[PDB]
Swiss-Prot record:
One of its GO terms (molecular function) is calcium ion binding. GO terms for cellular component: cytosol; membrane; perikaryon; photoreceptor inner segment; photoreceptor outer segment. The N-terminal glycine is linked to one of four different types of acyl groups. The most abundant is myristoleate (14:1), but 14:0, 14:2, and 12:0 acyl residues are also present. The Ca(2+) induced exposure of the myristoyl group, known as the calcium-myristoyl switch, promotes RCVRN binding to the photoreceptor cell membranes only when intracellular Ca(2+) concentration is high. This is Recoverin. Homodimer; disulfide-linked. Homodimerization is caused by prolonged intense illumination. May form a complex composed of RHO, GRK1 and RCVRN in a Ca(2+)-dependent manner; RCVRN prevents the interaction between GRK1 and RHO. Interacts (via C-terminus) with GRK1 (via N-terminus); the interaction is Ca(2+)-dependent. Ca(2+) 1 binds at D73, N75, D77, T79, E84. SUPFAM superfamilies: EF-hand. CDD domains: EFh (cd00051). Ca(2+) 2 binds at D109, D111, N113, T115, E120. PANTHER family: CALCIUM BINDING PROTEINS, RECOVERIN.
Length: 188
């Protein structure tokens, strides 16, 4: 006797501006389908990787799947809600519109220090390697067949010296430069 939404729909669509949601009618039935996986209401971090197994049953994005969590599930919560979930899930795609793209400096900044360093870059770098398949690992330049050998390619592309800490401000431009950059540190 009442129109249901799923505890979320008007708060998210509010984002209609940044990035064009696949379809306002998408995150609608997607809310219940989740309630079925568990009559709960909070997604854990250990089970977060249990999902990536649907869109990538090939490689083992299990190492990079745990990084996308603290990426935005640190908002003083401890659990990922469906609202913030659609944001990240659709961010890894939904094409490239205006603004946005800022959520990227969030997944790469694991610790979250307003600035990225070689360490964090190393973790996400090695993890991303797992997602890559050996059969395809032969395509990338051998000058970086290992996480320790590539850190020089990525960090070398940007070019840090005095302020050896990449900020979220440039993290967006340093990439807007050569469209062939985001291809390396690419994420899915
Ligand atoms: C109020 O009268 C009860 C809630 C009515 C909800 C309307 C939708 C009912 C149909 C749900 C199943 C539809 C499957 C396509
Ligand atoms: Ca959260
Ligand atoms: Ca940091």
């Amino acid at each position: 006797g009442n129109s249901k939404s799923g505890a979320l729909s008007k708060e998210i669509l509010e984002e209609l501006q940044l990035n064009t949601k696949f379809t306002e009618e998408e995150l609608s039935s997607w809310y219940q389908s989740f309630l079925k996986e568990c009559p709960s209401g909070r997604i854990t971090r250990q089970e977060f990787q249990t999902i990536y197994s649907k869109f990538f049953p090939e490689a083992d994005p299990k190492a990079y799947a745990q990084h996308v969590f603290r990426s935005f599930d640190a908002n003083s919560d401890g659990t990922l809600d469906f609202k913030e979930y659609v944001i990240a899930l659709h961010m890894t795609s939904a094409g490239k519109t205006n603004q946005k793209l800022e959520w990227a400096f969030s997944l790469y900044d694991v610790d979250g220090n307003g600035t990225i360093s070689k360490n964090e870059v190393l973790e996400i770098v090695t993890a991303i390697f797992k997602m890559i398949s050996p059969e395809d690992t032969k395509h990338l330049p051998e000058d970086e067949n290992t996480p320790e050998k590539r850190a020089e390619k990525i960090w070398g592309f940007f070019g840090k010296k005095d302020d050896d800490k990449l900020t979220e401000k440039e993290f967006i431009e340093g990439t807007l430069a050569n469209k062939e950059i985001l291809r390396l540190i690419q994420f899915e």
